[PDB]
């Protein structure tokens, strides 16, 4: 749905759809070359549905074609500085594709704007939908829009006849977080049964390692997900499927 969504919002007014409790394959996101832009940064793009994360965010908007460069880890530029900034430790991928076939009025779309004025660049994932007129000069910009009072919000003119460098592109960026809490989505790899007392390769709820699995007398506390060792290394894990 979010990819085949009929509509997108502006870059400054960028959607942040939270995603949880899924079975993500991403397989359709490999074969489908419909995404002219597909640049995983945190992880190898091929290796996703073999991994999984606590939570994932789907930020969506539509921007100018060239600006796809601006959305990069630590990238610089007006959209990046005034409309949407990526985390320096970006954990995920960026999906962008041309939307001229959709985001183009015959007379040109005015529907998509961008904030080109701000006295302080946004933090990563910050979202400033502020509408108030921007004071360009030093005058007290008192409700009068115009000289020394410029409108920070400027619209894209998306005509079908514009250049590709100016052509509208549909973009969705996914950000992941591989944290301590149980993951909400994991890729399609069917589990197996418990095994005891054998040097085996294991992978629990995404946590990977090798060794021998033993029951323990460890008194976890009813919330405690799992333990670690004084080497900050894993000591014990709880089966998701069994306490």
């Amino acid at each position, epitope marked *: 749905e979010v990819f085949n969504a009929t509509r997108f919002a502006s870059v400054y007014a960028w959607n942040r759809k939270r995603i949880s409790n899924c079975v993500a394959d991403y397989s359709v996101l490999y074969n489908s070359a419909s995404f002219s832009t597909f640049k995983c940064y945190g992880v190898s793009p091929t290796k996703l549905n073999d991994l999984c994360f606590t939570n994932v965010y789907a930020d969506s908007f539509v921007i100018r074609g060239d600006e796809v460069r601006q959305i990069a880890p630590g990238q610089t530029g007006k959209i990046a500085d005034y409309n949407y900034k990526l985390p320096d430790d970006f954990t995920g991928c960026v999906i962008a594709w041309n939307s001229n076939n959709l985001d183009s009025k015959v*007379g040109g779309n*005015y529907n998509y704007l961008y904030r080109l004025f701000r006295k302080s660049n946004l933090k990563p994932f910050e979202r400033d939908i502020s509408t108030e007129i921007y004071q360009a000069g030093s005058t007290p910009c008192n*409700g*009068v*829009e*115009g*000289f020394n009072c410029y409108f920070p*919000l400027q*619209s894209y003119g998306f005509q079908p006849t514009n250049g590709v460098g100016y052509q509208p592109y549909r973009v969705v960026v996914l950000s992941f977080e591989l944290l301590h809490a149980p993951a909400t989505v994991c890729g399609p790899k069917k589990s197996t049964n418990l095994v005891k007392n054998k040097c085996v390769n294991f992978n629990f709820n995404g946590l990977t390692g090798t060794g021998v699995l033993t029951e323990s007398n460890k008194k976890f506390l009813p919330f405690q997900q799992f333990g670690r060792d004084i080497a900050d290394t894993t000591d014990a894990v709880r089966d998701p499927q069994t306490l």
Partner: antibody
Amino acid sequence: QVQLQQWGAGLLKPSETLSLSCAVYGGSLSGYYWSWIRQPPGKGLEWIGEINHFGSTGYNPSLKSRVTISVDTSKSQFSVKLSSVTAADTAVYYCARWGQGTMVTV
Amino acid sequence: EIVLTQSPGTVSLSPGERATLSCWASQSVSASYLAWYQQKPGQAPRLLIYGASSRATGIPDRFSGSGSGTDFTLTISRLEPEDFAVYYCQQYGTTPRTFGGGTKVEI
């Protein structure tokens, strides 16, 4: 394609109110700036109010606290509501971002 | 409060002559905030020049604007048989957007 049709004009008794209609075709009123322009018979143009697409709106001092402009994105129509009308408000109101003109007699 | 002083109030000219419309403002208008409108009799306002230097889209090249500060000047280098209309200038450098009284182009 691009056309702005004005409506809501007519003769009005003093101190009454009025609501303008400005039907736009081919334009996104919520996405482009809109203003209403009046012209009394034999005078020049007088900018009364303007509405920024994001929602911001302003009114000239002669219509301050008496006029109210808004838009129905549900119909993509520009509206200019004036209250406490008088003789001096008689002017030809055409809506522009121009329209066809709507004579107001009061 | 910016009152635009257009002169002359009337101008009679023959076709092919150069017609200049003068537009002075009571206060200096920053960044050439001057817009020109030509209003045919019984017709709606029609934009001619924007920013006092940028002509409107589709307006003839015979139209030309000039001036800076407290002077705005509209030039029609070669008069046209349909150029005998009222021209009103509008200054939008202040919140009270104001226009000039209009100059009538006669025959």
